[PDB]
Amino acid sequence: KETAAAKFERQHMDSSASSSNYCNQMMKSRNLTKDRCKPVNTFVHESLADVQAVCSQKNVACKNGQTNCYQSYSTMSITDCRETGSSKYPNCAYKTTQANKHIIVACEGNPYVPVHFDASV
């Protein structure tokens, strides 16, 4: 079975955001258009070590009220992918938006790594 850590890497990490077609290719490549069009998804364009290190940065509440969330001290390169108003499965269409923002992730397990993308600020 896919672990929560693995699922986070598949859905949110892009350690290789280039072109207007990035989100279309990436949402496909990461199996996020298989059953449905996943409507919103963020990719972090940083090293896995740099994102895993967020689990030792600023402790904050998560959106659901758990207290195992962490805010990155630094801004990170992110791509926001959001489905168009016109997008219809199986023809999933996304707008790609590049930003430099703080990320908030939920951390769990041993090793203690991100398992949930909470938000970018």
Question: Which of residues 57 and 87 has its CB atom nearest to Pt ion in the complex?
Answer: 57
CB atoms within 10 A of CB 68: 16
Does residue 120 bind a copy of itself (CB under 8 A)?
A: no
Considering the candidates 14, 37, 76, 116, report the single residue annotated as catalytic: 116
DSSP 76-97: EEEEEEEE-TT-BTTB--EEEE
- Does 9 bind a copy of itself (CB under 8 A)? Our answer is yes
Angstrom distance (rounded) from CA 121 to CA 115? 18
Does residue 112 belong to the site contacting a copy of itself (CB under 8 A)? yes
Q: Binding site: which residues?
A: 7, 10, 38-42, 63, 82
What whole-number distance in Å separates Cα of residue 26 and Cα of residue 14?
A: 9
Q: Is 55 in the site for a copy of itself (CB under 8 A)?
A: yes
Active site residues: 12, 116
